[PDB]
Curated annotation (Swiss-Prot):
Active site per database record: E35, D52
Coiled coil: none
Gene that encodes the chain: LYZ
CDD domains, sorted: LYZ_C
Protein name: Lysozyme C
C-alpha cells in the first residue's frame, strides 16, 4: 500500500506513534517519506546481507526474521514480511522498540540525514488529525 501523507500521519497517530519517546508526528512521517516514500512494500538489500522492510525500512540484522541474515536477531519477534502489510501495526510496534533502544530516531540514518533539525511539522501541515 502506498499511503497518502495525511493518511499515514493519521494511521501513525492511531497507533500511538505521535510524540512517542518525544518524537512528534512530523518526525515519523518525514522518516517514512525518505525511507519508503510511504510504500509499505518497500524492501532494500544492505551490503552486509541484511534487508530493510516496510514503511520505516526496519532492518533484519536486529529487528525481524527473514531466514537469510546470518547471525542476526529478531528483537521485535516477527517475520520481516509482517512489516510489508497494508496494516502498519507491526511496523509501528517494532519502531517503538527501535526508538527506545538508546539512540532515539538516529537509528534511522535517513531521519538523521534528512529530517533531524528540519521543519518536520511541514509533513503534517493541513492534515485533519
Ligand atoms: Cl510535527
Ligand atoms: Cl536469519
Ligand atoms: Cl540518508
Amino acid at each position: 500500500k502506498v499511503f497518502g501523507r495525511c493518511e499515514l500521519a493519521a494511521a501513525m497517530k492511531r497507533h500511538g506513534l505521535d510524540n512517542y519517546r518525544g518524537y512528534s508526528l512530523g518526525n515519523w512521517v518525514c522518516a517514512a517519506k525518505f525511507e519508503s516514500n510511504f510504500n509499505t512494500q518497500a524492501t532494500n538489500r544492505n551490503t552486509d546481507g541484511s534487508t530493510d522492510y516496510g514503511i520505516l525500512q526496519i532492518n533484519s540484522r536486529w529487528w525481524c526474521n527473514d531466514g537469510r541474515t546470518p547471525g542476526s536477531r529478531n528483537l521485535c519477534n516477527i517475520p520481516c514480511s509482517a512489516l510489508l502489510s497494508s496494516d502498519i501495526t507491526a511496523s509501528v510496534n517494532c519502531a517503538k522498540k527501535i526508538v527506545s533502544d538508546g539512540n532515539g530516531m538516529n537509528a534511522w540514518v535517513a531521519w538523521r540525514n534528512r529530517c533531524k533539525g528540519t521543519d518536520v511539522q511541514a509533513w503534517i501541515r493541513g492534515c485533519r488529525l
